[PDB]
Amino acid sequence: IDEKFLIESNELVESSKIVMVGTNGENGYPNIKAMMRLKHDGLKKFWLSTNTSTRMVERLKKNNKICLYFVDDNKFAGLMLVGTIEILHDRASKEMLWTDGCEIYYPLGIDDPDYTALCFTAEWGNYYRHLKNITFKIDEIY
Amino acid sequence: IDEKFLIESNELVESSKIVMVGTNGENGYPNIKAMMRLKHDGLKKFWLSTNTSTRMVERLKKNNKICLYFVDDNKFAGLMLVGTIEILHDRASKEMLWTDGCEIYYPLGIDDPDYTALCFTAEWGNYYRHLKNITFKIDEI
Ligand SMILES: [Cl-]
Ligand SMILES: [Cl-]
Structure with missing residues (x-):
């Protein structure tokens, strides 16, 4: 619960x-x-991009329990967040989330058929460091 | 399955x-x-270590299906292997798998109580590059 972790x-x-x-x-x-x-948005919410694959989409439709992992191997530290993900199909959202260097991956812009946008909402996490970990619920760390 | 993406x-x-x-x-x-x-050994067998954890031991005894992912550090690409894992509880295996480098994580050596070794056996691979992936069966290649 110390403020260092969130930062x-x-x-x-x-x-x-x-x-x-x-x-x-x-x-x-x-x-x-x-x-x-x-x-x-802090550790609460992530909006992510990936290539449209029918496999992935069909899979997320049937089971949206996921986790995210962030690492720096130099510190042998990592952060894992656990939660659920939803695909955002509306062009409004896709447009608002578009960034520079989306262009590198999606040549045809917001309407590129391979641009899929997802919203992940974290329930809890685990910070790993010095071969230990601290588990926290998101609602606690704020 | 070609030899370029497998190299x-x-x-x-x-x-x-x-x-x-x-x-x-x-x-x-x-x-x-x-x-x-x-x-x-190639893409078929991987020996891994991590810190001893009773939560992970119980997890893996209930369900030993796992994947490995290898990040490419110089381009947007990676390798995912899928298969099963087994914890090597025996000192003989831990002694054999011990590498210079382990002493950083496990200062008491082979007998460090935090030293756990595991053996992953891959069945399928997936290579990601150019926003695409190639899936392969390890025993075919
Ligand atoms: Cl909206
Ligand atoms: Cl030596």
Whole structure:
């Protein structure tokens, strides 16, 4: 509950545009994919970008329990957040979340058929560091 | 399945000291944790260490289906392996897998009570590059 974590975890989040996203894959195996962080609100909410794959979409439709992971291997520190994700289908949201260097990935702009936007809402997390971890609920850390 | 994207998969694995490990967690949620690579054999077998944790031991005994993810540090790309994991509780295995480098995390050595070794066996791979992925079965390649 010390203020350092939220600030330290926030630096961790801010330090890369890439987030590792864990999902429930086929046949009971977890799957991890890299996604792009379009926006976040502290540790409460993340808006992410990934390529439209019917596989991923169908999977998230049936099971939206996910986790996010942020790491710096140099400190051997990481942050994991656990929560649920929803696909944002409306163009309004897609437009408001669009950023520079979305363009690198989605040449046809907001209307690129491969631009999918997601909203992750964190329930809890775990900060790992010095081979220990501190688990917290989001509603506590604020 | 071609040898270009599999040469990059192996290079990525050989350069990796830390690997992201995805496990099936409480209440239906995936969980991810960084673990250290001790040894591997191609893309089929990976020996990992992490700190001893009774929560993780119980998790993995209920459900040993996991994935590994190797981040490419120089471009938007990565390798995901999927398979099953087993904890190596025996000192013989821990002695064999011990590498110079472990002394940083486990200062009491092979007998450090926080030293846990695990053996992952991959069944399927997925290589991500250029916003695409190629899926392959490890035993075919
Ligand atoms: Cl709206
Ligand atoms: Cl020595």
